[PDB]
């Protein structure tokens, strides 16, 4: 075949009912998920790729960067309740990765204040029971997939992107077989 299980993909030998239909997983100290967003722009090509009515979740993880790693899954909540995602994720992969201005959860902080969220607004979500749920669905997601590594992606909790076997001589060709891998496993 064209697409074969262990190739471009592998399937969970344990799928996870009721799972988001494009599921996603990234932290801010990730090298590759940092190229991810920044370089390739995968999630974004992902959905122009997408059928109508599908959606796309993409979830933070706590395994990397210990105490500042938790904090950013907190912050991650916090951007998705607020929907400001699209204004946070550039400054946050530099800040951890780049300029490393990033230690703490207030350096976090900044980046939402500079970003033009409101200090009280930030801190009210921060500490409010709709982002602790939303954590709670970001780390239930990962547990629910026996997640160790990312960047990783997941379509309808039974088929897991496999980027390794994809040729990376070219860095669009390997945005579009990616895309179209998606696609692909969407329709399945």
């Not at 993409?58 to 998705?80: I, R």
């Not at 530099?94 to 230690?103: F, L, W």
């Not at 980046?111 to 801190?123: C, S």
């Amino acid at each position: 075949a064209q697409y074969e299980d262990g190739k471009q993909y592998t399937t969970l030998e344990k799928p996870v009912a009721g799972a988001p239909q494009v599921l996603e997983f990234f932290s801010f100290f990730c090298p590759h998920c940092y190229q991810f967003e920044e370089v390739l722009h995968i999630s974004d090509n992902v959905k122009k790729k997408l059928p109508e009515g599908v959606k796309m979740t993409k979830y933070h993880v706590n395994f990397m960067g210990g105490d500042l790693g938790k904090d950013l899954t907190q912050a991650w909540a916090v951007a998705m309740a607020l929907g400001v995602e699209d204004k946070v994720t550039v400054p946050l992969f530099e800040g951890v990765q780049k300029t490393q201005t990033i230690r703490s959860a207030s350096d976090i902080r900044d980046v939402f204040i500079n970003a033009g969220i409101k200090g009280e607004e930030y801190d009210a979500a921060w500490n409010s029971f709709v982002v602790k749920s939303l954590v709670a669905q970001q780390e239930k997601a990962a547990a629910d997939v026996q997640l160790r590594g990312v960047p990783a992606m997941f379509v309808n909790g039974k088929y897991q992107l496999n980027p390794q076997g994809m040729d990376t001589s070219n860095m669009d060709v390997f945005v579009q077989q990616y895309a179209d891998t998606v696609k692909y496993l969407s329709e399945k």
